[PDB]
Amino acid sequence: SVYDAAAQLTADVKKDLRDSWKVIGSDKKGNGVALMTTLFADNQETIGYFKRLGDVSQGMANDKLRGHSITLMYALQNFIDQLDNPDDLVCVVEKVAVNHITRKISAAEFGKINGPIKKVLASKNFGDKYANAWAKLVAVVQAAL
Amino acid sequence: SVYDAAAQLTADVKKDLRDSWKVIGSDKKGNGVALMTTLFADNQETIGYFKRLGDVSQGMANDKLRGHSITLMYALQNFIDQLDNPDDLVCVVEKVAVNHITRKISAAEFGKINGPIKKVLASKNFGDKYANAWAKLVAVVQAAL
Ligand code: HEM
Ligand code: HEM
């Protein structure tokens, strides 16, 4: 269950999540857009899903993409803040899950975000240990998809 | 015009928004649910729009309502954090606007949130001065609906 996946996040994992978020979460506009642009660059097959955003190749100049990217970073902020209470983490995770289920996004497709996250983390010198921690958090959402 | 509305956020208004947010934003779960339950209580005609959340009268005990409420508070956190740059504030406001336009929510009905905000602020000892400040921020979203 989603609860099982959340309850499985250890103190060490939460520590790495919080430490890395202190940095990548400090520039939501910059890192948020970087995350989306990396997703489109390495997984071009996902571009079609974001037609509402218009031409995503415009990057920062695209107001719809910028608004989307910043908002996505607050969803992650939400997750990070609820880490110590699995009950609260689960209900916010399920909220995000529903928004993607309605778009026909499978658990496997949702996991495509791990690549971009790893690269963005690496840009700030956060290695594999941190990428693995984030994959565990993403896995919590996948449990609901 | 969302841009003209955003221009109404003067130095004094922004200060009042930040000062009051430091208090109400400290407990997103509690105040988030308080806002929603107040909305449903004072404006029963809006409950129909929230069919997905199930029995909203259950308040905090309703997992979907709690998840929804916390997420809403992060939308406000988003707005507050973008007060420095009007171009960024506008793109995140339009993002939220789209989510309501699709649910057929008009500017007039969106404005029904002012009552709840006024009451929640009042319970924390923040009077009309602050309620009016928030009314102006809500007005920015209304301009995009
Ligand atoms: C870190 C993981 C992710 C998070 C936290 C996340 C978060 C979000 C949020 C908050 C929204 C806005 C929901 C709304 O207002 O309707 C959104 C929309 C969306 N997401 Fe994700 N997402 C993630 C990964 C993905 C991935 C990997 C895909 C695709 C393979 C995806 C596809 C979509 C689509 C299609 C939309 C709708 C965009 C639109 O039309 O406005 N998401 N996501
Ligand atoms: C401070 C004002 C408000 C803010 C910042 C706000 C923010 C949000 C956010 C972020 C969501 C989640 C979007 C999603 O993931 O689909 C949402 C959903 C929604 N909002 Fe609002 N909202 C506000 C006022 C209102 C009002 C006054 C109404 C109606 C009278 C309304 C009706 C809805 C509905 C119907 C949903 C969909 C709920 C669901 O089915 O899950 N909102 N709102």
UniProtKB/Swiss-Prot annotation, chains A, B:
It holds the Pfam family Globin. Heme b binds at residue 100. Belongs to the globin family. Residues 8-145 form the Globin domain. It is found in: Cytoplasm. Coiled coil: none annotated. The lineage of its organism: Eukaryota, Metazoa, Spiralia, Lophotrochozoa, Mollusca. One of its GO terms (molecular function) is oxygen binding. This is Globin-1. GO terms for cellular component: cytoplasm.
